[PDB]
Coordinates of C-alpha atoms and ligand atoms in Angstrom, one line a residue:
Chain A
X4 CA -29.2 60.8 1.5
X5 CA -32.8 60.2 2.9
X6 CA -34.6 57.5 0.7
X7 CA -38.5 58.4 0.2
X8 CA -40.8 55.2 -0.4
X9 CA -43.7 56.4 -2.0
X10 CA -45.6 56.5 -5.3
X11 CA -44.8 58.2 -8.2
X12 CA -47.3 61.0 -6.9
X13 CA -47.4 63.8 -4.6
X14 CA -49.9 62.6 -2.4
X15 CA -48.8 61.9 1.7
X16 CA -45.5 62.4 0.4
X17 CA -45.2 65.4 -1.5
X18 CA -45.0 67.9 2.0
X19 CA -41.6 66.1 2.9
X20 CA -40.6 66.8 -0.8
X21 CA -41.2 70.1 -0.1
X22 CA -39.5 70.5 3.2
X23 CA -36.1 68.4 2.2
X24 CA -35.8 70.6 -0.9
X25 CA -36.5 74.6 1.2
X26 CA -33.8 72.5 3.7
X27 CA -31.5 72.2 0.5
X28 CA -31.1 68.6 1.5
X29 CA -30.0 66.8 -1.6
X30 CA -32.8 63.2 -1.5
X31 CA -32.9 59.6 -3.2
X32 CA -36.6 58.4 -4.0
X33 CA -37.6 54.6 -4.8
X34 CA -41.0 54.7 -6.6
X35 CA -43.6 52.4 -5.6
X36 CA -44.9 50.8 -9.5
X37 CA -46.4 47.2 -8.0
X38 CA -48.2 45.4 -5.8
X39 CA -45.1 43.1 -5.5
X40 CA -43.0 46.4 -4.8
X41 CA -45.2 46.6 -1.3
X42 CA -45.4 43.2 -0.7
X43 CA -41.6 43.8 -0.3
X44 CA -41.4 46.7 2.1
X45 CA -43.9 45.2 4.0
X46 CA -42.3 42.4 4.3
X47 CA -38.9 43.2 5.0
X48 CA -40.6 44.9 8.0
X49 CA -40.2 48.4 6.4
X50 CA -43.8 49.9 7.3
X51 CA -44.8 50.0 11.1
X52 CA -48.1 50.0 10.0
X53 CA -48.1 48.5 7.0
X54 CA -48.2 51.7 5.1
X55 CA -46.0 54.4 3.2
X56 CA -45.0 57.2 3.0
X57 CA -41.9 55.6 4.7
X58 CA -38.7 57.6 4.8
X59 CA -35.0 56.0 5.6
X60 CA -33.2 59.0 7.2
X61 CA -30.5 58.7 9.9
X62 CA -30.4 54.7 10.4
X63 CA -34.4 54.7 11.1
X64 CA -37.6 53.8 8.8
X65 CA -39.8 56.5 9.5
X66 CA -44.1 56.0 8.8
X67 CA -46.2 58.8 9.3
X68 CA -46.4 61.9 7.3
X69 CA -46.1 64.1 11.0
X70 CA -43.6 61.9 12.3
X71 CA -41.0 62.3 9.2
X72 CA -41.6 65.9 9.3
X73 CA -41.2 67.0 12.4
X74 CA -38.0 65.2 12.2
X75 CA -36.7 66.9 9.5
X76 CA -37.7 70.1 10.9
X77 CA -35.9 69.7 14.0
X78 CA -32.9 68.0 12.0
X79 CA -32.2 71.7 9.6
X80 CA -33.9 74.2 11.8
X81 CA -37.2 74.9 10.8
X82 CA -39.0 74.0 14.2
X83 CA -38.6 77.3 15.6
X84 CA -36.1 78.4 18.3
X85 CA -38.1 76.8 21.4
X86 CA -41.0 74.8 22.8
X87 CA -43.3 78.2 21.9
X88 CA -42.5 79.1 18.5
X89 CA -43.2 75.3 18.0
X90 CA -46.5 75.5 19.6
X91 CA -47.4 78.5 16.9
X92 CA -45.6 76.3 14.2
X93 CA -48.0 73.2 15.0
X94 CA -51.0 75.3 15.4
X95 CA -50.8 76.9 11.8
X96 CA -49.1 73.6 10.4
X97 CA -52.2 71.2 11.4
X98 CA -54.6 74.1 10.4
X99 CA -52.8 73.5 7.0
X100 CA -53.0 70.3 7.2
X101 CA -56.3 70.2 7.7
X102 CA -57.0 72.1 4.2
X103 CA -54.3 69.9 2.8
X104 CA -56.1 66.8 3.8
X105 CA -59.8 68.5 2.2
X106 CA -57.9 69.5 -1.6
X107 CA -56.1 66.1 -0.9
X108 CA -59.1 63.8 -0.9
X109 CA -61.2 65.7 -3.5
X110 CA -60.5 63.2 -6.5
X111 CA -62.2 60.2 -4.3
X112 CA -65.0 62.3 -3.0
X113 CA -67.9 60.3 -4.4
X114 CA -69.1 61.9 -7.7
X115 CA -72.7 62.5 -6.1
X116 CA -71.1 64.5 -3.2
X117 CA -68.3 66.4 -5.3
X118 CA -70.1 69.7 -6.2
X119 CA -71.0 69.9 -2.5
X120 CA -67.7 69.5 -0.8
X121 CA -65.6 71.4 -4.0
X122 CA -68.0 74.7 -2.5
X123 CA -67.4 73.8 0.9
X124 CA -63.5 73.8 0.3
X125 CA -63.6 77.1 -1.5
X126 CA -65.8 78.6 0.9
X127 CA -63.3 77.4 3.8
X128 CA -60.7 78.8 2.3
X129 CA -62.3 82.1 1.6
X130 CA -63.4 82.5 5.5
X131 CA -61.7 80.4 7.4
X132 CA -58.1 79.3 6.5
X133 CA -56.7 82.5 4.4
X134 CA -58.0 85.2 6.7
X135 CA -56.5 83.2 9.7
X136 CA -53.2 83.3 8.1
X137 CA -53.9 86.7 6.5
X138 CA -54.3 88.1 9.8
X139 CA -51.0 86.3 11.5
X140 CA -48.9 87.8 9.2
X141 CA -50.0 91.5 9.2
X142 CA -49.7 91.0 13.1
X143 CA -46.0 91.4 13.0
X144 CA -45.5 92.8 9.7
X145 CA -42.6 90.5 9.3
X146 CA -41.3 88.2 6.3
X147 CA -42.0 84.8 8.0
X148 CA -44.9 83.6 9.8
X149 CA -42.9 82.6 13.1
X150 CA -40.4 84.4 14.7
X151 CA -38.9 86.2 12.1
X152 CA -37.1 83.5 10.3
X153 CA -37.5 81.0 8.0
X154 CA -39.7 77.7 9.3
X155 CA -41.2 74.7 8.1
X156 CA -44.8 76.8 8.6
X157 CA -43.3 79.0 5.4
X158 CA -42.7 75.9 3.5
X159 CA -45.8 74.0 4.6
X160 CA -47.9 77.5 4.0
X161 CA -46.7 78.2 0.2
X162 CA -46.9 74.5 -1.0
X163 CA -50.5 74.8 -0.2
X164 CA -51.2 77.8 -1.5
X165 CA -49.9 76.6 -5.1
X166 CA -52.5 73.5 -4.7
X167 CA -55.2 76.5 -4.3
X168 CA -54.0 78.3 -7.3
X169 CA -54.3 74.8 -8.9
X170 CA -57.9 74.9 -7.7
X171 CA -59.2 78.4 -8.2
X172 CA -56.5 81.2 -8.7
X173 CA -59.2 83.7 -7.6
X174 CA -59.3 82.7 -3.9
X175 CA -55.8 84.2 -3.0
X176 CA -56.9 87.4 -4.4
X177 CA -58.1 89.6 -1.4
X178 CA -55.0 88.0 0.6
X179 CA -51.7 90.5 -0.5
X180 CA -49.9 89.3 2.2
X181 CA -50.3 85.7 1.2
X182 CA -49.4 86.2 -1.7
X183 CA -46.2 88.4 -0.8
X184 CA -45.3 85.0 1.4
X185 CA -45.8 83.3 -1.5
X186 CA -43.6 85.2 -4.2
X187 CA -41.2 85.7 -1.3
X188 CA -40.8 82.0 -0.3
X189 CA -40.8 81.3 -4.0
X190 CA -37.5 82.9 -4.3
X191 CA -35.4 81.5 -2.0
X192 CA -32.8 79.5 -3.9
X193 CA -33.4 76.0 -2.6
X194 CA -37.5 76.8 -3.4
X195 CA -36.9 78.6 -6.6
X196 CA -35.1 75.2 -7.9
X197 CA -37.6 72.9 -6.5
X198 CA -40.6 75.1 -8.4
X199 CA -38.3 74.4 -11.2
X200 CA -38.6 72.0 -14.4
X201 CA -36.3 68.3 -13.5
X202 CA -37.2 68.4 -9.8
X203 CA -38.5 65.7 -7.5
X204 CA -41.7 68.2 -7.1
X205 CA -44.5 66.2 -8.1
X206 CA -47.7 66.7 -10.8
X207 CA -51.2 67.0 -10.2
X208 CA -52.4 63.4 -9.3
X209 CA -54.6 62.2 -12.6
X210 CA -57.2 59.4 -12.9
X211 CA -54.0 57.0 -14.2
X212 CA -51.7 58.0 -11.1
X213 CA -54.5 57.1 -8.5
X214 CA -55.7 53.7 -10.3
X215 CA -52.2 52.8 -10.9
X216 CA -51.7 53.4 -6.8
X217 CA -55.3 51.3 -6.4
X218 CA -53.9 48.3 -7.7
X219 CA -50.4 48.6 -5.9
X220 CA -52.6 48.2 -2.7
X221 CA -54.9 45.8 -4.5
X222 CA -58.0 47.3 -3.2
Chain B
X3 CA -51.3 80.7 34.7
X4 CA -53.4 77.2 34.6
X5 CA -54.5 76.2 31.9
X6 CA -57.9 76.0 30.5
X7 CA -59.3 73.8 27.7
X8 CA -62.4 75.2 25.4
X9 CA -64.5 72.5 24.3
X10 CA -67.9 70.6 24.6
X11 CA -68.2 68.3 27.8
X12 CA -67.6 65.2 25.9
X13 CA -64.5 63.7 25.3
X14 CA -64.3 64.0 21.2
X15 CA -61.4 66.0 19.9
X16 CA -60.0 67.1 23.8
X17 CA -60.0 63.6 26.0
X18 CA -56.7 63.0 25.0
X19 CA -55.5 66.2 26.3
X20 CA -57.3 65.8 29.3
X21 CA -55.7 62.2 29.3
X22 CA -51.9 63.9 29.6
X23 CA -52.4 66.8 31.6
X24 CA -54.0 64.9 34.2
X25 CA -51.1 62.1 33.6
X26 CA -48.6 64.9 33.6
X27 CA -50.3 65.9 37.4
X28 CA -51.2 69.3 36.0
X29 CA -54.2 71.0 37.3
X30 CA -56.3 72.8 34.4
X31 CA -59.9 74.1 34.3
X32 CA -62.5 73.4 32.1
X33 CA -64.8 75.8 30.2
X34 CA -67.9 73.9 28.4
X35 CA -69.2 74.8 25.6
X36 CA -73.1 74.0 25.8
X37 CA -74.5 75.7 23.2
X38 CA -73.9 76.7 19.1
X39 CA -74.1 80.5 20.9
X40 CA -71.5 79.2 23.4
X41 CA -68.8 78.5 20.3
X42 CA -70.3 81.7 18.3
X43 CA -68.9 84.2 21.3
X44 CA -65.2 81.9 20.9
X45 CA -65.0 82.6 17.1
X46 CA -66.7 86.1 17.4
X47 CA -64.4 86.9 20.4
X48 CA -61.2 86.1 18.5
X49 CA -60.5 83.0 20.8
X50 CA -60.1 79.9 17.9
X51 CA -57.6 80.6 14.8
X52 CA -59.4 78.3 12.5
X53 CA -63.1 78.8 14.6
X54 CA -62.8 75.7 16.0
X55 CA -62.4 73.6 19.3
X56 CA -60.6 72.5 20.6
X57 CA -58.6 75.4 22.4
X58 CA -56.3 75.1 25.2
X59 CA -55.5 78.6 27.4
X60 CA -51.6 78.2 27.9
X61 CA -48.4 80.4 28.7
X62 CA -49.8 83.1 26.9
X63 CA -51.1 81.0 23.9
X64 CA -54.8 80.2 22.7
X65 CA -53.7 77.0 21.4
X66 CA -55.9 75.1 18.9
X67 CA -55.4 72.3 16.9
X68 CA -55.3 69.3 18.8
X69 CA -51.6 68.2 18.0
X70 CA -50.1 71.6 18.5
X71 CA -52.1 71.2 22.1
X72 CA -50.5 67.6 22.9
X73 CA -46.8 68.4 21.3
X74 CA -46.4 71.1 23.8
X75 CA -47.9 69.8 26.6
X76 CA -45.7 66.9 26.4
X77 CA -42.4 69.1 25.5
X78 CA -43.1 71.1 28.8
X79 CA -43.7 68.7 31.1
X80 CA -40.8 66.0 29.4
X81 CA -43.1 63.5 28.4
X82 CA -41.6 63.7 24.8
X83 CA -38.4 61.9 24.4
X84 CA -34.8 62.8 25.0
X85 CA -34.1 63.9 22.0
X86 CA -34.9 64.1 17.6
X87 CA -34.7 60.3 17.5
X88 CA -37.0 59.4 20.6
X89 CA -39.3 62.0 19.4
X90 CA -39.5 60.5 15.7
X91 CA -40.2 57.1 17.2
X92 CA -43.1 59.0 19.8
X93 CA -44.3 60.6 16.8
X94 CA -44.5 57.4 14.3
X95 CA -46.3 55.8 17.4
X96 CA -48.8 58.2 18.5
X97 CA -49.7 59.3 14.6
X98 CA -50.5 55.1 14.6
X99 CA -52.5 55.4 17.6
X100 CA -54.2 58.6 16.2
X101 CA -55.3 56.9 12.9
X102 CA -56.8 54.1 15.1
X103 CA -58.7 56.8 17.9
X104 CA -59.7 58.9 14.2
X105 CA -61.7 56.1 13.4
X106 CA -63.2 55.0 16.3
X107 CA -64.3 58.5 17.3
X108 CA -66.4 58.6 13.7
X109 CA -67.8 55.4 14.3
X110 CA -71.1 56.7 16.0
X111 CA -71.5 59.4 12.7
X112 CA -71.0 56.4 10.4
X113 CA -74.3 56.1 8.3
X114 CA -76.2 53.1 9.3
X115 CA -75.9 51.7 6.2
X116 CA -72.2 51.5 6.1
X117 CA -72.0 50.7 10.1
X118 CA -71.6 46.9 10.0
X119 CA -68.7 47.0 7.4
X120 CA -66.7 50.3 9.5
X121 CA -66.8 48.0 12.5
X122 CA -65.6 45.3 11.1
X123 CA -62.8 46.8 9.5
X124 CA -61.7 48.7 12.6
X125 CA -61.7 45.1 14.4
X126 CA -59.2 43.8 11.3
X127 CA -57.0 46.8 11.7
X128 CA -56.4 46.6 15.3
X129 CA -56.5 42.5 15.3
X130 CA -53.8 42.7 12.4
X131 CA -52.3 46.0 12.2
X132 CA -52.3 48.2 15.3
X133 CA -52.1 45.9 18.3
X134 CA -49.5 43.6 16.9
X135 CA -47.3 46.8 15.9
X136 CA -47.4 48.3 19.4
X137 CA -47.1 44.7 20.8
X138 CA -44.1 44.4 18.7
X139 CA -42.6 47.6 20.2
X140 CA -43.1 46.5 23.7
X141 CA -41.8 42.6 22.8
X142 CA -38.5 44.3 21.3
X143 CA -37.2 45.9 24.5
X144 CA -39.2 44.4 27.5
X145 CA -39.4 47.5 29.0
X146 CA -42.1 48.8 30.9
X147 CA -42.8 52.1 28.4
X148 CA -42.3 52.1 24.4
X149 CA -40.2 54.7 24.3
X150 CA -36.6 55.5 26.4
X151 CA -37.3 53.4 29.5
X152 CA -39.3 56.4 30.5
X153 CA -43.0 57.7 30.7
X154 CA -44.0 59.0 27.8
X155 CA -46.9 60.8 26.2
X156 CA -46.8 57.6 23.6
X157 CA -48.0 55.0 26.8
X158 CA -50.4 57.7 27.6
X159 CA -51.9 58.0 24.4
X160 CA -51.9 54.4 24.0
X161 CA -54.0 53.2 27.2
X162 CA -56.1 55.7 26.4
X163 CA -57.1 54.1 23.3
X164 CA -56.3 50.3 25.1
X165 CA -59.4 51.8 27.0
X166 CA -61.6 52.5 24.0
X167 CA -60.8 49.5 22.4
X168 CA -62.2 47.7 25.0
X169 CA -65.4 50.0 25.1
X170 CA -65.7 48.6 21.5
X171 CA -64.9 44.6 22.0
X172 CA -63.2 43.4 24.7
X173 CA -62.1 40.6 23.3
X174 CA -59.4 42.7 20.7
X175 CA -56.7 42.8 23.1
X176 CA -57.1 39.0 24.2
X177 CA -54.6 37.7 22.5
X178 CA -51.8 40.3 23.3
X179 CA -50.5 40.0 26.9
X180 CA -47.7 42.9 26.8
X181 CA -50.4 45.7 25.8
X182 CA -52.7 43.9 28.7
X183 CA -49.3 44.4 30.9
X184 CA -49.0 48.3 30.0
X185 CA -52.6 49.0 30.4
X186 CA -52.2 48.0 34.0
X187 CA -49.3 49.4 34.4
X188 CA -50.2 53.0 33.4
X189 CA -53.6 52.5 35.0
X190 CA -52.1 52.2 38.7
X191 CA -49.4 55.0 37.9
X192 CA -50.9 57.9 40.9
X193 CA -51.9 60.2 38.1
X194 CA -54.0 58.3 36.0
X195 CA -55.0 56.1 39.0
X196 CA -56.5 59.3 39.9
X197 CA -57.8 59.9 36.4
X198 CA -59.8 56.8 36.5
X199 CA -61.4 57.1 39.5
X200 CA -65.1 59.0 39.9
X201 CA -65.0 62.8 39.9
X202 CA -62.4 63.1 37.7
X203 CA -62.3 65.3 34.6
X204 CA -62.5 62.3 32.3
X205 CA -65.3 62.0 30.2
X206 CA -68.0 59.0 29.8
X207 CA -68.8 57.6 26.1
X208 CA -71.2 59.6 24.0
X209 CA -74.5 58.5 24.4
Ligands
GTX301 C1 -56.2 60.5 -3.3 C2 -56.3 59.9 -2.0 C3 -55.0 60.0 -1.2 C4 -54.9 59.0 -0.1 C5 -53.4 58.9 0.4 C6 -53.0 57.4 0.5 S1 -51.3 57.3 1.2 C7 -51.3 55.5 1.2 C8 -51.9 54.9 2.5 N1 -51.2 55.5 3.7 C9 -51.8 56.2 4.6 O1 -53.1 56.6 4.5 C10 -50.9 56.7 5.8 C11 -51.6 57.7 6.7 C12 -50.8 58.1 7.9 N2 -51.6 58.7 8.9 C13 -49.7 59.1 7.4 O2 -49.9 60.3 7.5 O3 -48.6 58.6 7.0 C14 -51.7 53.4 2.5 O4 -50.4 52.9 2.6 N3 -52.8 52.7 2.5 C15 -52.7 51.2 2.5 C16 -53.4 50.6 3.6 O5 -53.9 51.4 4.6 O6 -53.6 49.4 3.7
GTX302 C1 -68.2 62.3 17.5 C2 -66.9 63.1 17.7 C3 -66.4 63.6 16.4 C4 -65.5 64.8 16.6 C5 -66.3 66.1 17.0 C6 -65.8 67.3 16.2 S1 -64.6 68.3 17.2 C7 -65.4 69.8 16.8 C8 -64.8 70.5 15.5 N1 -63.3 70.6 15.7 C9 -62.5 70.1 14.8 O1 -62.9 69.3 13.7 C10 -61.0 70.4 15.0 C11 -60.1 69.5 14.1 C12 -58.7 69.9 14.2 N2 -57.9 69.2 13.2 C13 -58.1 69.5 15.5 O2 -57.5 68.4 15.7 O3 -58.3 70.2 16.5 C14 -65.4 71.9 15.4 O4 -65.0 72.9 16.3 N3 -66.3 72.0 14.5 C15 -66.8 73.3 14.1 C16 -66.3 73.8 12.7 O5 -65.5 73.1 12.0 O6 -66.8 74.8 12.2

């Protein structure tokens, strides 16, 4: 079983979450409560960089949100079928990422700024990132974003798109085919359980989660 | 058939790139984007998936995203590991070194008011985070690269930023001898000897 090091949250973690649970690989998960709790990974030499998310998977201590998960998409076969596919996969992926990251970072925009940059969000996501993947998908008419089979980009895609409905359920609207993905990806078995009551799959990060995470770092 | 990378002529979000091509001996052209009309005709023309830079022309593609640009770069010219295992340990590395070149690059955008203190605890991080973790990875096996005995994009990536570093104070790597060793090292390999030199793509600092 891979052991997950992270807060009680989704934050940098919840992606791998995700992508171990659409893999149907079974996880372990040792919450982060204390500041004494990272004292001890850190210094036990668990954190590279003196940071989690941290993941014990096959004899290593992997940091790095990318690094774990493109390890684990390699591992189960979700990286594509070669070094091209994986090109398309990383494109879409870090364009994903780069949304994530926005939504992610929201609840410690300072207060002043937070109309501004909740508008900006919506309006990228409106015209930039949903049309983008819109338009990949009624390319090839196909089920899956890359190469007609299942891939982390599916998994990585969806997840996202369920922190949008989160934020406005409107924005999806004028997007059927996302939204087919999404329903589609939805019911795959491992997916369907995940999205499921009693799974690792994480809330909405409150006020209390974040604080609680604050004084773990003791900033 | 040779590639061709999209993007301002400064090195921002594509001097890494530039970096492993050129490291990788692969010849590319450039195409500058001097004006806000010049990146209007890239979105309007269907060039950037997200409307951004930067883009690389490659095998077919009209890769952007800066990571999808450097993963397959270094798959195709095997400056990414052996296998899963040497690629997590590139990956954990170069994801380091791309947290530390993230804030760097924003330094100059910094508002003045908040300048002093960003500096500062960029100098902390690599004094007492970065450096000594790469210096610990170098300490560990002895070997001349971090990763498989072997170039890698992760020694690369790493002089790269041993070269910005020093930009910023060069005083920061003082006290670590085996990331001074590297930096030489990589910096009379041919390719990047060549890289260095006058005339070469690389880029100066923004000014
Ligand atoms: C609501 C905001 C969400 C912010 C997420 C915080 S994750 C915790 C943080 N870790 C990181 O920022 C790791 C980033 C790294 N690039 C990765 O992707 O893994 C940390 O250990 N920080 C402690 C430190 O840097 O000293
Ligand atoms: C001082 C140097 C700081 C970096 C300069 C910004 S690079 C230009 C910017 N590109 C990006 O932000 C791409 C980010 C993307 N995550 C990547 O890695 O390629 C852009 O095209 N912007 C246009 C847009 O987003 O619409």
């Amino acid at each position: 079983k891979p052991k997950l090091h992270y807060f009680n949250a989704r934050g940098r973690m919840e992606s791998t979450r995700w992508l171990l649970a659409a893999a149907g690989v079974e996880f372990e998960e040792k919450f982060i409560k204390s500041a004494e709790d990272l004292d001890k990974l850190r210094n036990d030499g668990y954190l590279m960089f003196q940071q989690v998310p941290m993941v014990e998977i096959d004899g290593m201590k992997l940091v790095q949100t990318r690094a774990i998960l493109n390890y684990i998409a390699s591992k189960y076969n979700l990286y594509g079928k070669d070094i091209k596919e994986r090109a398309l996969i990383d494109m879409y992926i870090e364009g994903i990422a780069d949304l994530g990251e926005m939504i992610l970072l929201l609840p410690v925009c300072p207060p002043e700024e937070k109309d501004a940059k909740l508008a900006l969000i919506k309006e990228k996501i409106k015209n930039r990132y949903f049309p983008a993947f819109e338009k990949v998908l009624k390319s090839h008419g196909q089920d899956y974003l890359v190469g007609n089979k299942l891939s982390r980009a599916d998994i990585h895609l969806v997840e996202l798109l369920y922190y949008v409905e989160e934020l406005d359920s409107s924005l999806i609207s004028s997007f059927p085919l996302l939204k087919a993905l999404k329903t589609r990806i939805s019911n795959l078995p491992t997916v369907k359980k995940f999205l499921q009551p009693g799974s690792p799959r994480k809330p909405p990060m409150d006020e209390k989660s974040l604080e609680e995470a604050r004084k773990a770092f003791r900033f």
